[PDB]
Nucleic acid binder design. Structure first.
Ligand SMILES: [Mg+2]
Ligand SMILES: [Mg+2]
Ligand SMILES: [Mg+2]
Lengths: 64, 113, 332, 274, 174, 64, 277
RNA sequence: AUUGAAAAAAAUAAUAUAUAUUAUAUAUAUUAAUUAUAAAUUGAAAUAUGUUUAAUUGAAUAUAUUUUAGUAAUAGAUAAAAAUAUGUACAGUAAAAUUGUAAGGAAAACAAUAAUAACUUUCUC
RNA sequence: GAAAGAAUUAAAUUAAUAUAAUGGUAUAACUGUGCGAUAAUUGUAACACAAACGAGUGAAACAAGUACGUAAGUAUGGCA
RNA sequence: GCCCGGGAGUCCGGGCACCA
């Protein structure tokens, strides 16, 4: 109920995916991991789109 | 955005913060730095000397006191006992002020009570 | 005004550059624009002068057995700004006589302090972590720095950081040591020895390792300023085991080459010692035993480590050695 | 992570090794906090501390004199008691906690030339309680503290939870400042010359306020804070003011000594009988 | 040099008369303009201060004038005066060689001493403690107004025998 | 009901680059009840301050 | 010789005999360890050398050995070709340098063995480029060659006399080079200069500079440049740079600047950059 | 480099430029930046250009151009209030109880509460 | 004789451990902080413990890449 | 998981797959 599964696809287009579980609110996940096809680390990104529990963009530039 | 009180509070906070108020850290030429270091060392040495002086003086005083006590016990026992009487509640004059930077209008008092 | 005088006091205690001295006494930052930009702190002059006067006075007061005398001298000098300037802002490794004399005690002391601050510590760490000490020689107490170099092969210039990996090319020909002594020792009568040992060569009989002595100098004369052990100095009489290079066998781990420096036992002139150059077994070699025999006291050490590579075969060939064994990749 | 098992391998040398120096990571951090090269540098002896001078010249000797008993040796206080070995169970047993209390107590050394009572440090804690509701109050209090002292305070957060009062952990409430050296002396002078006098009905510090190992404490109401110079000059600027506690740590072995020392600096202890 | 900027915006209001007055006393820092050479570095100004350099701030109602720290000097005579060396510790000394007020068994010693000296003038002293010092000497501190003579620690060395000075040198503080 | 100032993302003070708080202060002249002047370093902008109610006039500090 | 897993399970890292012990270094801790052989006790003497196993066997079987020799890390394999290429390039460069040196020698007219001399020169140059006093560098170079010769002799079981002769020849060559030739500021080769001579030259240059510190024309500037053009042969690099900084000041003592008085606009004598630049 | 002030160079490190080597070295030069980051009509400052007055100076005031003011914490390798639960690197100790202190107590916050034998450096008889 | 440093000894302990109970833990696994979001990666896993089988548990080593670390090394999620 | 009814978000009620 809280934790859904998601598929993370290699940004190098070897089509090697890896799966992980996250909370429903969880931010858009990416993680760099080893891709055995390309034989080097690469970024893995969410394949399917999903709504995210929106967080306010914290302001570094002293606004107002 | 914010109430006047809030603004005031913010200002107050800023007064304490180092935000935008602090200057750039002072750099030094090598020679200058060396000179500074030397000066510091000298100062330290002076301080140490002063401490020794004072400490030494204190020690001497203590020794003197001890000697007196030794004499006193030998000589007048009652007197010695009286001298010993522990000062558990002793408290400084209060009229005996702390040194100021510049002296007062009446530079000393004659009449009292 | 003792620091102004230079009769008995060596000339090295002053700043050799005149401009700098002038600046100090009433700058260096080369560029004109930068100089213009610069703004020193106020009231530095008079206060500085006062400080100098104070410290000079102290030095004078200080001024009056050998070690004690040396110590006193050091105490007197240290606070001299000029000496500080010299030490801090000029190179201690490739020392230059007149700028920093290690004949002069103050400078020596400063050097020692510097060593203690960093390099010595680093060396110690390397020894401990890599298991140099307990494995070869029980312990040491630092005493003197020892910096090695491999100038002849390749041709480049670099002081080796302790516990580095050197290519077989680099360590193909012999090294150069600089044993920077401190601690008020005799110079005429005191001799030294230097041993490059590697304790991890594969013993197949026992299945453990055995320690080889790959390079051995004895009865070397040193000087506080002149301490580079080049073929100029030592001569062929001083070599007990002539240099053999690191030639690690394939898959025989990382062989640790640990250079030890010892000082001779002291009894009129320079006391030598014979060491049965032929009899001494170098292929398998007991360091501790050797030390016990000749009563050495290990002052300083340095270390590097070698691994197999394509180049080693060539090196072996050059040196006229066997082709070199090859070991299984598994630690079975 | 596989291990989870802390075990330092023993070494084979007596060289100390200050790891930080072997790392090139924090090159500014390598220097002392008083070496000019460091960004953490600030000057210490900006001018002379008059109060400290007074202590050194006049008071210290007096203190040495007055405290001196004849051949008073250490009356070492109550410690952890070892177990009588009249049974085998005592063998590897931890010792008995002190006869009097749970905590172990220090030895009282005689007042000689080497260890005369002195002022060590002054800690001011202003726990504004109304800050449970309004967090801006805390900030204001901190500012006030800063104004009073001239050295950065540190925030005091609510360490406990309790329903009866509206108190929940993790809530900034008040400010705490540690005063030392010349600054502390200055503060004390300000307290004594200006504030404590000006406060209307003040009969002096209470004589029971001894920490018992030579520490003394006293309060100041929200009204008295107006009497400080940095606040008095602008009453328009300070609508709300906050009361505070003041703790004074001394090199004194016992409370009475400490209070005597304080009296030397013009602190009226007419509050009570010891 | 290292101080923070003076935060005038807190102390003084941005439309006040006092604030205006304050501003009038102050002179600003030379700002930067595109097209000019600043050979002393470019002005790094933030919050109304050049970061590069030290920054200073100019400032019954009455100007506070301090009293002179030298009345003794003016006097140039009164060795029997208390308002003499104000920033120095003084000690009472009496003539006969000449020395500290000696006074020659039912009472406690310090108390007796106090009593003895109280009679010679009519002054107000405070004994530091019953504990004596030296050969039996008591210490005491004055609070009110053969020779009544007052001296510093250095001045006494000239006015007394060497041996005596040696005996009681460590008593006389600076 | 909890009235707060909602914090910004704070500034990272690097290790070694922390500069100690040297607040701007003036060497103020403090005149007491009597003519005794005393110097103290204060953060408020004022050269001179004379005082009406001080320790020197209060009976508790002096029985004269 | 004992490991510890996630459960705090103790396991053997090496073949051997299990022992339980108390270690003095760690009071109030019980230890399990593996002694490498039975006879010896396990809380082993702290300073005595640590008994290691090694425990790899050597590939006698020749094919296997060959295979082992062949096989290397993947990283090495990846970056080997590149490395080789780099090496080749370096070699080429060296060859070129050697050729240049030879040409220079020919121009000079010095006797030469020639190849050896060239090699020596190159070595010296390399040393110079790296941080070495020149004489010392030369010596080092000589020594390298000597060492090589010795090695060769050892390899081929030479008649020592021959070796000696070779050494002598080498020494002679070095002397010839040392006396005849010397590298410069910019690491190019020219005819030799002694120390005193060099000093004299420097002095002369200084004098010239002093004389002609006006520079009131293009011609003058040109002359100055020409004069500078021979400075490398008798001057250190840093010194030369300093000199250049001093005397080819891009401008001499229409813009605008600031001053301590109040802005200050300056037109300038416009013959300060035309001849300068 | 030109402006100020009144022959050169000899560390570490950083930056710029070059080259040496199947060695992350060396040579030359210089020592920058160290809490900043968009968007403000009335806040403040500076400079440039005018007019007036006691060739210039100061002062007043006008216009232009810029600079500041968005005010926001910890300033310490922070250490038992909250917030980050996995890696590594470096560091440090908790809790209770007792004695105290404005409101403040059974129960808010802060402070204090074990031994210096030996050793090193510094200052001193 | 003093100051400072390095400490050392004693007490360590029920505080704290994402979570029950137990065992552990200051040499800290507990806490703080820098960097880092990387070992909460990819092929072979011997050999043990446990075990009817199905399963489970610890895990050396080989190879590929990554993170932190001056280095030694450490990391195949969480003190168990 | 997908589709509705009461730009985004929350809170509720319908369906439509999944149902080995
Ligand atoms: Mg437990
Ligand atoms: Mg963990
Ligand atoms: Mg099974």
């Amino acid at each position: 109920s809280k934790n859904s599964v998601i598929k993370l696809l290699s940004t190098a287009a070897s089509g090697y995916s890896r799966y992980i579980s996250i909370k429903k609110g969880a931010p858009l996940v990416t993680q760099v991991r080893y891709d055995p096809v390309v034989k080097r680390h690469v970024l893995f990104k969410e394949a399917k789109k999903r709504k995210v529990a929106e967080r306010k963009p914290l302001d570094f530039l002293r606004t107002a | 955005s914010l109430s006047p009180l809030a603004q005031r509070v913010v200002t107050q906070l800023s007064v304490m913060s180092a935000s935008r108020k602090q200057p750039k850290l002072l750099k030094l030429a090598r020679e200058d730095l060396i000179k500074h270091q030397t000066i510091e060392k000298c100062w330290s040495i002076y301080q140490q000397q002063q401490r020794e002086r004072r400490n030494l003086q204190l020690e001497l005083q203590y020794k003197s006191i001890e000697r007196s006590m030794n004499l006193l016990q030998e000589l007048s026992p009652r007197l010695f006992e009286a001298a010993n009487a522990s000062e558990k509640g002793k408290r400084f004059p209060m009229e005996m002020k702390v040194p100021t930077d510049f002296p007062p209008n009446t530079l000393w008092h004659y009449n009292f009570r | 005004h003792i620091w102004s005088d230079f009769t008995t006091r060596p000339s090295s205690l002053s700043i050799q550059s005149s401009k700098v001295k002038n600046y100090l006494f009433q700058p260096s930052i080369s560029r004109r624009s930068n100089r213009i930009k610069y703004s020193p702190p106020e009231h530095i002059d008079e206060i500085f002068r006062m400080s100098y006067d104070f410290l000079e006075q102290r030095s004078s007061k200080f001024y009056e057995n050998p070690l004690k005398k040396d110590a006193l001298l050091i105490k007197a000098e240290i606070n001299n700004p000029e000496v500080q300037y010299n030490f801090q802002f000029n190179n201690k490794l490739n020392n230059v006589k007149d700028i920093i004399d290690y004949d002069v005690p103050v400078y020596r002391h400063l050097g020692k302090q510097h060593w203690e601050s960093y390099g010595q510590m680093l060396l110690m760490q390397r020894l401990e972590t890599l298991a140099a000490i307990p494995d070869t020689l029980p312990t040491l107490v630092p005493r003197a720095e020892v910096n090695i170099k491999f100038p002849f092969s390749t041709g480049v210039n670099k002081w080796i950081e302790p516990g580095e990996f050197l290519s077989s090319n680099v360590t193909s020909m012999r090294p150069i040591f600089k044993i920077q002594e401190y601690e008020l020792v005799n110079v005429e009568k005191q001799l030294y020895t230097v041993l490059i040992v590697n304790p991890d060569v594969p013993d197949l009989s026992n299945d453990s390792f055995k320690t080889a002595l790959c390079y051995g100098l004895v009865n070397i004369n040193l000087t506080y300023n002149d301490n580079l052990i080049d073929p100029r100095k030592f001569h062929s009489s001083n070599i007990i085991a002539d240099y053999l290079p690191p030639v690690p066998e394939k898959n025989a781990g990382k062989q640790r080459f640990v250079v030890w420096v010892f000082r001779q036992p002291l009894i009129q002139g320079p006391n030598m010692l014979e060491i049965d150059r032929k009899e001494l077994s170098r292929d398998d070699f007991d360091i501790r035993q050797f030390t016990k025999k000749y009563n050495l006291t290990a002052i300083g050490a340095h270390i590097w480590r070698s691994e197999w590579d394509a180049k080693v075969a060539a090196v072996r060939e050059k040196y006229g050695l066997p082709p070199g064994r090859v070991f299984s990749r598994v630690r079975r | 992570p596989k291990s989870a098992c802390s075990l330092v391998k023993p070494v084979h040398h007596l060289v100390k090794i200050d790891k930080s120096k072997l790392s090139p990571r924090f090159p500014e951090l390598k220097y002392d906090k008083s070496d000019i090269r460091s960004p953490g540098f600030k000057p210490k002896d900006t001018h002379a501390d008059r109060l400290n001078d007074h202590y050194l010249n006049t008071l210290q000797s007096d203190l040495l004199l007055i405290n001196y008993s004849h051949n008073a040796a250490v009356v070492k206080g109550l410690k952890q008691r070892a177990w009588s070995g009249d049974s085998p169970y005592h063998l590897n047993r931890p010792p008995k906690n002190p006869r009097g209390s749970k905590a172990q107590l220090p030895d009282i050394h005689p007042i000689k030339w080497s260890n005369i009572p002195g002022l060590e440090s002054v800690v001011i804690n202003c726990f504004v309680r109304e800050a449970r509701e309004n967090q801006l109050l805390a900030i204001t209090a901190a500012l006030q503290l800063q104004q009073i002292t001239g050295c950065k305070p540190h925030p005091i957060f609510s360490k406990n939870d309790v329903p009866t009062w509206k108190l929940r952990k993790g809530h900034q409430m008040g400010a705490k400042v540690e005063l030392k050296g010349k600054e502390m002396s200055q503060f004390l002078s300000t307290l004594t010359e200006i504030v404590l006098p000006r406060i209307r009905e003040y009969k002096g510090i209470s004589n029971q306020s001894g920490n018992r190992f030579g520490g003394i404490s006293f309060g100041l109401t929200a009204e008295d804070i107006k009497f400080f110079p940095e606040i008095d000059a602008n009453q328009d600027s300070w609508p709300k003011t906050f009361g505070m506690h003041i703790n004074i740590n001394t090199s004194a072995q016992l409370d009475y000594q400490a209070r005597t020392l304080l009296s030397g600096f013009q602190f009226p202890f007419f509050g009570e009988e010891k | 040099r290292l101080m923070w900027t003076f935060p005038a915006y807190f102390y003084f209001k941005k439309g006040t008369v006092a604030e205006h007055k304050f501003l009038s006393l102050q002179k600003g820092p030379i700002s930067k303009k595109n097209g000019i050479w600043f050979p002393r570095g470019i002005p790094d100004i933030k919050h109304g201060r050049e970061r590069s350099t030290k920054q200073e701030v100019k400032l019954v109602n009455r100007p506070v004038i301090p009293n002179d720290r030298i009345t003794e000097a003016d006097r140039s005579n009164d060795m029997k005066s208390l308002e003499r060396q104000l920033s120095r510790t003084l000690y009472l000394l009496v003539k006969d060689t000449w020395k500290f007020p000696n006074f020659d068994e039912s009472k406690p010693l310090h108390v007796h001493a106090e009593n003895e000296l109280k009679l010679l003038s009519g002054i107000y002293t405070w004994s530091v403690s019953a504990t004596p010092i030296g050969v039996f000497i008591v210490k005491s501190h004055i609070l009110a107004g053969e020779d009544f003579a007052w001296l510093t620690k250095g001045e006494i060395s000239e006015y007394v025998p060497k041996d005596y000075f040696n005996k009681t040198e460590f008593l006389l503080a600076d | 009901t909890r009235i707060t100032l909602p914090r910004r993302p704070a500034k990272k003070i690097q290790l070694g680059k922390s500069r100690p708080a040297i607040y701007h202060q003036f060497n103020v002249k403090m005149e007491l009840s009597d003519g005794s002047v005393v110097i103290r370093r204060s953060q408020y902008p004022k050269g001179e301050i004379r005082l009406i109610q001080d320790q020197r006039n209060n009976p508790l500090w002096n029985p004269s | 010789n004992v490991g510890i897993g996630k459960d705090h399970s103790i396991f053997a890292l090496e073949p051997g005999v299990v022992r339980y012990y108390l270690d003095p270094f760690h009071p109030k801790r019980k230890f399990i360890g593996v002694a490498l052989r039975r006879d010896l006790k396990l809380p082993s003497p702290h300073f005595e050398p640590t008994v290691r196993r090694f425990g790899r066997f050597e590939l006698t079987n020749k094919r296997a050995a060959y295979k082992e020799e062949n096989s290397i890390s993947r990283k090495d394999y990846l970056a080997k070709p590149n490395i080789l290429k780099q090496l080749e390039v370096r070699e080429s460069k060296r060859k070129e340098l050697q050729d240049k040196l030879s040409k220079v020698l020919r121009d000079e007219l010095k006797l030469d063995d020639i190849e050896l001399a060239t090699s020596y020169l190159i070595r010296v140059r390399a040393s110079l480029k790296n941080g070495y006093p020149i004489e010392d560098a030369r010596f080092n170079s000589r020594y390298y060659l000597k060492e090589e010769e010795r090695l060769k002799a050892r390899r081929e079981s030479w008649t020592n006399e021959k070796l000696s002769e070779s050494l002598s020849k080498i020494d002679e060559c070095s002397d010839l080079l040392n006396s005849s030739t010397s590298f410069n500021n910019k690491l190019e080769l020219h005819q030799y200069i002694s120390e005193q001579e060099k000093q004299a030259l420097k002095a002369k240059l200084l004098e010239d500079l002093e004389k002609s510190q006006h520079l009131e024309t293009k011609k003058d500037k040109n002359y100055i440049k020409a004069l500078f053009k021979d400075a490398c042969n008798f001057l250190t690099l840093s010194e030369e740079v300093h000199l250049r900084r001093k005397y080819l000041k891009s401008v001499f003592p229409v813009s605008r600047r600031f001053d301590y008085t109040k802005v200050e606009v300056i037109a300038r004598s416009r013959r300060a950059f035309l001849s300068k630049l």
